[PDB]
Amino acid sequence: ASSFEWFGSNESGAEFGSGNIPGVEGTDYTFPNTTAIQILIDAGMNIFRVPFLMERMIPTEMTGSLDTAYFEGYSEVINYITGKGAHAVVDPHNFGRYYGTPISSTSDFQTFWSTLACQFKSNDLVIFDTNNEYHDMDESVVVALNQAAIDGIRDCGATTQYIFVEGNAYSGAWTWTTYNTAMVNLTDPSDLIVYEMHQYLDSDGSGTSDQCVSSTVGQERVVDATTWLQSNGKLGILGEFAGGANSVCEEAVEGMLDYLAENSDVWLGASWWSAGPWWQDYIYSMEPPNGIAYESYLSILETYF
Fold it and tell me: Apex CA 126: angle with CA 292 and CA 189, to 5°?
């Protein structure tokens, strides 16, 4: 049966046109399409990372109140997902940044979390993701922001839910020992921490390309991050990943995913980037009926379900 605990897809749209805050619903952004999620549940996908913006969710100050509309829109998608007994990763897809500025205050960032997590404390199925891809910031600030998030989360009474933590340098698996050695120290009263890492297989690991380095680069780019979790006794999930619609990329996705499954003692799952209504002709679209990674990878991914 199941090679991992979890397997799913990112569901994007609510974090789009990030150049536009608040931005208009239906024009700059949109929520995932529940019909299509369902098409991906029928299929065996049982966890879904749904990104959003901190700026649209709780405008002006991250100490502020929730935007009723945008959050009403957002919860509707999270509740459908869990409603069918699948895990729903709440992803403030903001890159360590609030209105362009690196988040530095731990207090405001926890007051952001306690306000978001509050709305989901009694939903066993929701998983909290502190922020997407901390980059070009100090390690200490990132560790402390991961620590604050946890605190505002638990302190609001969401003690049942997994917390997904994320490294600096875009929380990438290939660079995890270069930079994120110190993420070790983070603590949880519920002890439900998982080190969510991303891995892409292009030259620079940006994602932006449908060409892979090699057919082995996958398994290569996650050995260091794996031993780290084994050695320090931690759990991790490859939060984001993809391959381009071509043999070499697939070969490397299969090889990378083998290694993770052979190491399921520490790897709890993975989720394709990305499903969602507005991807269209995207190299990495898992949205049916005609998403390129749908036609390409869906038959490969349901080998591990």
Answer: 130
Resolution limit, Å = 2.6
C-beta neighbour count of 259 within 10 angstroms: 17
DSSP state of 170: G
* Torsion 293-79-89-135 (CA) sign: positive
Asked whether the beta carbons of 57 and 11 are under 8 A apart, the reply is: no
Q: Is the dihedral of CA 19, 150, 79, 280 positive or negative?
A: positive
Tell me how crowded residue 197 is: count the other CB atoms within 10 A of its CB: 30
Dihedral Cα 299, 85, 269, 303, nearest 10 deg: -20
d(CA 158, CA 189): 11
Residues in the chain: 305
If residue 107 lies in a helix (H) or strand (E), which one and from where to where? helix 106-118
Query: Apex CA 50: angle with CA 181 and CA 108, to 5°?
Result: 60
Q: Please answer whether residues 18 and 56 qualify as being in contact, where contact means their C-beta atoms are separated by less than 8 angstroms.
A: no
Residue given tokens 């892409």 in the structure block:
200
- Domain definitions of the chain by residue range: 1-305
- The one-character DSSP state at 67 is P
User: Hey, which residues are catalytic here?
Assistant: 133, 240
Helices (H) and strands (E) in the chain, counts: 10, 10
DSSP class of residue 161 equals S
Q: Is it true that the peptide bond before 102 is cis, omega within 30 degrees of 0?
A: no
Pairwise CA distance, residues 155 & 107, whole Å: 13
